[PDB]
Design an enzyme around this catalytic site. Structure first.
Site, PDB file in Angstrom:
ATOM      1  N   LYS A 209      -4.284 -41.518 -15.034  1.00  0.00           N
ATOM      2  CA  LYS A 209      -4.844 -41.431 -13.714  1.00  0.00           C
ATOM      3  C   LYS A 209      -3.690 -41.987 -12.655  1.00  0.00           C
ATOM      4  O   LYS A 209      -3.200 -43.117 -12.753  1.00  0.00           O
ATOM      5  CB  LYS A 209      -5.937 -42.333 -13.359  1.00  0.00           C
ATOM      6  CG  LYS A 209      -6.508 -42.346 -11.893  1.00  0.00           C
ATOM      7  CD  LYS A 209      -7.633 -42.750 -11.727  1.00  0.00           C
ATOM      8  CE  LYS A 209      -8.270 -43.027 -10.400  1.00  0.00           C
ATOM      9  NZ  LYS A 209      -9.527 -43.575 -10.236  1.00  0.00           N
ATOM     10  N   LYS A 232      -2.632 -48.864  -4.756  1.00  0.00           N
ATOM     11  CA  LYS A 232      -2.880 -49.205  -6.176  1.00  0.00           C
ATOM     12  C   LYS A 232      -1.848 -48.796  -7.257  1.00  0.00           C
ATOM     13  O   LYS A 232      -1.969 -48.341  -8.253  1.00  0.00           O
ATOM     14  CB  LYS A 232      -4.326 -48.304  -6.446  1.00  0.00           C
ATOM     15  CG  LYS A 232      -5.283 -48.386  -5.358  1.00  0.00           C
ATOM     16  CD  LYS A 232      -6.483 -47.567  -5.989  1.00  0.00           C
ATOM     17  CE  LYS A 232      -7.733 -47.512  -5.133  1.00  0.00           C
ATOM     18  NZ  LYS A 232      -8.838 -46.932  -5.516  1.00  0.00           N
ATOM     19  N   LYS A 263      -5.897 -37.233 -14.138  1.00  0.00           N
ATOM     20  CA  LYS A 263      -6.444 -37.144 -12.915  1.00  0.00           C
ATOM     21  C   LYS A 263      -5.322 -37.494 -12.046  1.00  0.00           C
ATOM     22  O   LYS A 263      -4.789 -38.591 -12.248  1.00  0.00           O
ATOM     23  CB  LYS A 263      -7.600 -38.085 -12.702  1.00  0.00           C
ATOM     24  CG  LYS A 263      -8.198 -37.917 -11.302  1.00  0.00           C
ATOM     25  CD  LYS A 263      -9.285 -39.122 -11.255  1.00  0.00           C
ATOM     26  CE  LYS A 263     -10.107 -39.425 -10.052  1.00  0.00           C
ATOM     27  NZ  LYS A 263     -10.596 -40.787 -10.218  1.00  0.00           N
TER      28      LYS A 263
HETATM   29  N1  LIG Z   1     -11.816 -45.702  -9.357  1.00  0.00           N
HETATM   30  C1  LIG Z   1     -12.782 -44.873  -8.387  1.00  0.00           C
HETATM   31  C2  LIG Z   1     -12.361 -43.341  -8.160  1.00  0.00           C
HETATM   32  N2  LIG Z   1     -13.127 -42.287  -9.090  1.00  0.00           N
HETATM   33  C3  LIG Z   1     -12.926 -41.148  -8.599  1.00  0.00           C
HETATM   34  C4  LIG Z   1     -12.034 -41.247  -7.877  1.00  0.00           C
HETATM   35  C5  LIG Z   1     -11.285 -40.213  -6.899  1.00  0.00           C
HETATM   36  C6  LIG Z   1     -11.988 -38.693  -6.878  1.00  0.00           C
HETATM   37  C7  LIG Z   1     -11.719 -37.754  -6.110  1.00  0.00           C
HETATM   38  O1  LIG Z   1     -10.563 -37.743  -5.377  1.00  0.00           O
HETATM   39  O2  LIG Z   1     -12.381 -36.855  -5.987  1.00  0.00           O
HETATM   40  C8  LIG Z   1     -11.480 -42.526  -7.474  1.00  0.00           C
HETATM   41  C9  LIG Z   1     -10.878 -43.161  -6.237  1.00  0.00           C
HETATM   42  C10 LIG Z   1      -9.807 -43.941  -6.533  1.00  0.00           C
HETATM   43  O3  LIG Z   1      -9.557 -44.660  -7.635  1.00  0.00           O
HETATM   44  O4  LIG Z   1      -8.841 -44.290  -5.697  1.00  0.00           O
END
Ligand SMILES: NCc1[nH]cc(CCC(=O)O)c1CC(=O)O
Ligand SMILES: NCc1[nH]cc(CCC(=O)O)c1CC(=O)O
Ligand SMILES: NCc1[nH]cc(CCC(=O)O)c1CC(=O)O
Ligand SMILES: NCc1[nH]cc(CCC(=O)O)c1CC(=O)O
Ligand SMILES: NCc1[nH]cc(CCC(=O)O)c1CC(=O)O
Ligand SMILES: [Cl-]
Ligand SMILES: [Cl-]
Ligand SMILES: [Cl-]
Ligand SMILES: [Cl-]
Ligand SMILES: [Cl-]
Ligand SMILES: [Cl-]
Ligand SMILES: [Cl-]
Ligand SMILES: [Cl-]
Ligand SMILES: [Cl-]
Ligand SMILES: [Cl-]
Ligand SMILES: [Mg+2]
Ligand SMILES: [Mg+2]
Ligand SMILES: [Mg+2]
Ligand SMILES: [Mg+2]
Ligand SMILES: [Mg+2]
Lengths: 352, 352, 352, 352, 352
Positions: A209, A232, A263
């Site tokens: 991610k 982050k 992701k």
């Molecule tokens: N940890 C939470 C999470 N779970 C899904 C997304 C993003 C999903 C999307 O943009 O559709 C995020 C945001 C992030 O971590 O900043």
């Protein structure tokens, strides 16, 4: 030169292999088609809030923060099209958020109630709940932030994620989805889940991610933006890196994960393909909020045809190696598929 | 010992990875399903003769030597369920057979006529015509047999196969399928097609074709069994060998083939898989007449369920690496898929 | 055109490599033959029941539910043709079956007595006993079925299989063969065996066993069809999947298995070959009851030749990567081989 | 320490994997046996001379320079034991030897007459004839020597080898076996054969032939030792090199060869396995005269058991990747196998 | 035709790559030489008995059961040619041999006494000592035989082996060489040695040691032949198998082995290469007694040149991937290089 003439005087390039032959017409293209998209390969993520009425997410056009009642109606509509797998995110009331994120394991919290209610109404349906503190954090971070240092403290964060995961598991979550990127969390969650009797409960590890800027709209959905200019990048991965993804994927499979997630989606299809080649687990791709806004916004202005491009995207994910795709287009794509299958079948057919 | 107890006293085996979790229910199985079968991935092979009435083939129960009008009827019925590709084999009058196999390149012959007839009636049908001398051979061999030596003469056969190929191409065959296993015929046929302007006509090469005993019923259907105790072991491959198949595959790709065929089918799924790994060409497998007779025989006796096994078989061909499968069950399998999709949709859904 | 003339004016395609030359005659085919089948690579699976008289299995023609006395006769005939390995399945009285399937570890039960009896009569015989509750389960499942959920519960099932494996080992079984597809059973059984002093007893792990429809005639033999329209898809593997096979095979290897089994047979030769390529353990394939029925069905109607097709099938398992093949044709194959070697040697020769 | 005790106080080392389980008794070992030897994988190399009587070759104990009539008796004996492939070398009358080595392509020469006589007595026999000049060379070298430089001139040599191959082919040689190690001769020979209508005649390329000191006894047999304290190190390969063998093997495969020979045998198993891994052609190894002499010498002195060691040797060639093995033990091995198979069957069984 | 003519009209084959160009002369061959042999890569295995006078081993001509006195003179003469590694095997007085083989761990036994006296005499010498029970076994087996079953009981044997290695390590052995082929013994000996503070003592694991018939003369040297017609096939590996070798090599690496041994030598070079390719440990090959006897025998009879053949063999070992070679020719081979180096330098030169 290279051009000859054939027996009839016509220009003729004497090349033996002609790849275009396998593109000659639809029937041939279909014979050799290497990848297929189906509705039950799509994951539909939804947003629920603890309010009486639904509210649009303006930066995710066509998606909303649903009331409990509209959540049920939405799941039911998506099932009527052959969606079976649903992801649930809660927009928590701001007064409940804290630095420690203790609302994340409150068994009477919005999310457990929603899982309990969707399960009562649709017992055969498949529920994926996110495990991560940011929806519950007053700082907008997926883990606990240390008062003195400002660091997202790894191990203390894992202690919490475990509590959340069990709560969600107990409410009836089929699959928990740690999207937090803390070190070691798959194994820890796994062991806790198992000690509690929830050996059935699956873990969809967010392995690879990235620290992306394509999450803008999701954070609007949840009102979960980072406080005070913080990012982050000390936990989500540097988009400059591929090799590092193998490090993470290898660690998550051996810690017990059931599926690996990559992701964001289209801009990381190389990483998706690479892990797919190396992993023996199912892969999931996430077509994120920012990616969805991009499509809608271009479609709304007439620059692209929405239907053709969305269907092309999903085929691409699937070609790149995704067994499943989480996408906010999930419901709309299935609907298009079922309507073609009922109409003239311009582009669909049955499969098993 | 290896068993522990969980937080509630229940028996607990402390393993982390639990592959059963990805089998938990249909929704999850579908999320992670790696291979799909669709009708347009099936090729239906049919037999035509020059008689006024169709005659069953007793060793291929449910299949017939078709009269021209029943052939049209049968192609129509298969199309209606979504089959797009049809292989055609001529049962030739025994008067017309010979050593050199002249009837093969007769442009007034049965097969060319059938092709034209099906093209008039269904213009977007994909028609695959077999190239090989055994339907027209008085010795029942795929190539020309020498009088003094008894050898199937490779290069003189290939001369003939060129003559047949052009004939079928001109008739409207979208694809010719040399099933002869002579050396070098893909390159030779390709060049003759191209010299005549038929650069659009495809070659489905029978690359890895084994000297099998699963072809008997087909030979019943064409009345084409080998004369005088002889066999095809001098051109068809020894089933003992796998490495040799890579040799055949590599040569046929560089000779300009569009697709590669492995035949027979199920008993060669390993060769199918090996060549899929190596080749960049689409792969086709043939579920041969003997294999069809086995399913059918056991089905009629009540030993197996016909629908379940056939559909498992087709999923297997596809898992093993068949982009397309030739099977006498193609019509019936598409029919089942289409019926389910119109009914309860117990096991199908749309795809694209 | 590509065709030239040789020095004597005969038609000549000037290709250098010609694979047909290594097929010229039997002698050259024998020089280059890559795979060989021998009787001692075959495993013969038999059924025993506690009745005075043997009873044919109608859906597996030629095979019977054997009395103890006839079991010894049958093992003896198979030994005489060179079969050394025998797998034993018990048809248990309906009255001894139950949900916990505790008759599975009854040391005075039919299977342990069959093993002791066979060992007294042929002290060097190789015996492989299945491990799995389905022959003893009133539900027709390989594990214990939970009253409230209807789930086949994993860990409690492993505990039962550990007891079963110890009983069979203690009775004299050379190999235990867990066909249950519970997670983690190999390692658990291994440790149980070793703690009881049975470190010598081998484990033939069914790693890649698919949720197949070809097991029907076996289930007629044991009267062990699943109750209530249930199926085994929550534990046997989806036929749509290959990558999953590697997950299973790698884990059984590192849990200490001595051999890996892929089942069913011909329709899984791709999985067999892939696991062969990656494993360092011996491979076994199972030519299952349904596959047996198909061949017989066809042979009985005369659609195929029994002998030719059986002998090609066995060669195919071997080319695909089977060190050993479990097959209900084991005795018959060995017999054909031994008769040919004692007779005119049309297809056999000595090996070592 | 690392030892524990099992459930009965017996010393116990808790390792999970025990490879010894797969060595437990003959039956298990046979289940998992990776490689088999059979007579029809052996090539029996023989010496003929143009004299009335046969004469032992003292440095190859038990082999002789056969007279024509004894040649026939020996081939007949070896066939009765199942040998099918015979390699033939002429011990040429010294008055016929020369610098140009023109006797190598005399159609009335000893080798051609030997082939015609064998092919007339045993029509189904497989005959392999050496292509190389050293049996006919008065200097004992494999090619034409330049008067002024002493270099073995490559292309001139290839020209002569083409002449020799055509002669041997025309006499009925099934395979010609160029053992000269000139560059490019496989392609030249292939093309020369094809032009003369000998497209059937096979080429067994000596691809990896090393400049060995293990050919001594063979050179005694043909009286073909090099003159003037010279060597063959400018054509045969330096035993120090393995990479080089790949270069050699790739060239011959693309030049059209049917099989690839590595020579000598056991001291080059690493090369044999390497080319086996990278080649799609059948492999042959030569168990050369010097290696034969070492086994016979040690057996005659009682240092080793002849039979056990020879049999282990052929198994090793076969495990290392040889499809066929040229060995002066070929007849004696077949005999031991047939005798065992007809007698006690202590180490053999039937195969197909 | 294939040949053409150059600008002076000479016969010319227009091939571009010519491998003979890299064999043109010694200078060139030396430039491209891939492998070298040196004395310090050779291991010289010797025999000691507890008698006053040395005694020839008739079946290993030139090797003797050396007295302690003569053992020190032999290591000195070999150290004088550049050999630095020695293997020590004891012929034990037949009065001290037992079923349990307790003499193996006697700190006052012959072997410990050889070790100590060689270290005293040459501290810089590298001593390798065997670990195995057969020189001390009244049954002639590498492990303890159960009186009741006749099985070589693995774990109880490993208990003993640990005691022996500790003993030899305390005596001054730099390296212990478990030749026993029990399962798990490398790990067990390693932990044992470590707990005694022998962390510095190395283990050369006999990973892939085959059940060979080439060990005969060594067993003469020690009078250690197996009793009552038994064999070592339940622990030593089947020569039919290579895949199994990978499995042993992987296990011994992971248990802490410093080096890995393949044994026997020439007839296993394929196994040696494969293990070399996969392993990251140094590889050692053993040119065993039977192999030595074969060289000597043929040499004594004048069938081969001893010097050329030996040197070729050792080069092969090294090309196949031996970092070091245990051979009874170690002194004789080193003496040959030194003499050429100090002499006229026909085939040696310096290295580092
Ligand atoms: N940890 C939470 C999470 N779970 C899904 C997304 C993003 C999903 C999307 O943009 O559709 C995020 C945001 C992030 O971590 O900043
Ligand atoms: N070359 C012709 C051909 N094409 C397909 C088959 C067999 C197909 C079937 O069994 O379904 C055959 C016969 C054979 O090669 O002997
Ligand atoms: N664990 C039970 C078992 N063991 C072997 C078979 C089937 C064998 C065959 O069909 O011959 C089965 C049935 C099943 O698991 O459904
Ligand atoms: N080129 C001729 C030839 N063919 C086979 C051998 C040797 C075979 C043996 O030693 O048994 C040789 C001799 C050599 O090239 O020196
Ligand atoms: N474990 C004992 C041992 N160590 C070395 C050898 C053989 C050495 C030789 O042949 O030179 C043997 C004999 C055997 O295992 O039977
Ligand atoms: Cl639906
Ligand atoms: Cl589309
Ligand atoms: Cl589970
Ligand atoms: Cl299905
Ligand atoms: Cl054991
Ligand atoms: Cl056969
Ligand atoms: Cl015979
Ligand atoms: Cl043997
Ligand atoms: Cl040159
Ligand atoms: Cl040298
Ligand atoms: Mg991580
Ligand atoms: Mg071909
Ligand atoms: Mg498993
Ligand atoms: Mg060459
Ligand atoms: Mg070991």
């Amino acid at each position: 030169g290279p051009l000859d003439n054939n027996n009839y005087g016509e220009v003729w390039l004497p090349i033996q292999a002609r790849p275009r032959r396998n593109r000659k017409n639809r029937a041939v293209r279909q014979l050799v088609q290497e990848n297929l998209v189906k509705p039950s390969s799509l994951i539909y993520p939804l947003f629920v809030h603890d309010e009486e009425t639904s509210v649009p997410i303006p930066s995710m056009p066509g998606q909303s923060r649903l009331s409990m009642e509209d959540l049920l109606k939405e799941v039911g509509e998506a099932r009527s099209y052959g969606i079976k797998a649903f992801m649930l995110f809660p927009k928590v009331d701001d007064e409940l958020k804290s630095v420690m994120a203790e609302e994340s394991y409150n068994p009477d919290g919005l999310l457990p109630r929603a899982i309990m209610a969707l399960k009562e109404a649709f017992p055969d349906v498949l529920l994926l709940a996110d495990v991560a503190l940011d929806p519950y954090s007053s700082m907008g971070h997926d883990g606990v932030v240390d008062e003195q240092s400002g660091k997202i403290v790894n191990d203390l964060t894992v202690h919490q994620l475990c509590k959340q995961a069990i709560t969600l598991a107990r409410a009836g979550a089929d699959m928990v989805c740690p999207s937090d990127m803390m070190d070691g969390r798959v194994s820890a969650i796994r062991e806790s889940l198992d000690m509690e009797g929830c050996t059935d409960t699956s873990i969809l590890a967010y392995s690879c991610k990235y620290a992306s800027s394509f999450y803008g709209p999701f954070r609007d959905a949840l009102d979960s933006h980072m406080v005070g200019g913080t990012d982050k990048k000390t936990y989500q991965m540097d988009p400059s890196n591929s090799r590092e993804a193998e490090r993470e994927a290898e660690a998550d499979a051996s810690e017990g994960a059931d599926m690996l997630m990559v992701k964001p989606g289209l801009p990381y299809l190389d990483v998706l393909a690479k892990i797919r080649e190396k992993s023996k687990l199912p892969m999931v791709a996430y077509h994120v909020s920012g990616e969805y806004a991009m499509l809608k916004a271009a479609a709304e202005k007439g620059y692209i045809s929405e239907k053709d491009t969305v269907l092309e995207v999903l085929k691409s994910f699937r070609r790149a190696g995704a067994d499943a795709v989480a996408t906010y287009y999930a419901k709309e794509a299935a609907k298009w598929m079922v309507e073609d299958m009922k109409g003239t079948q311009k582009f669909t057919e049955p499969c098993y």
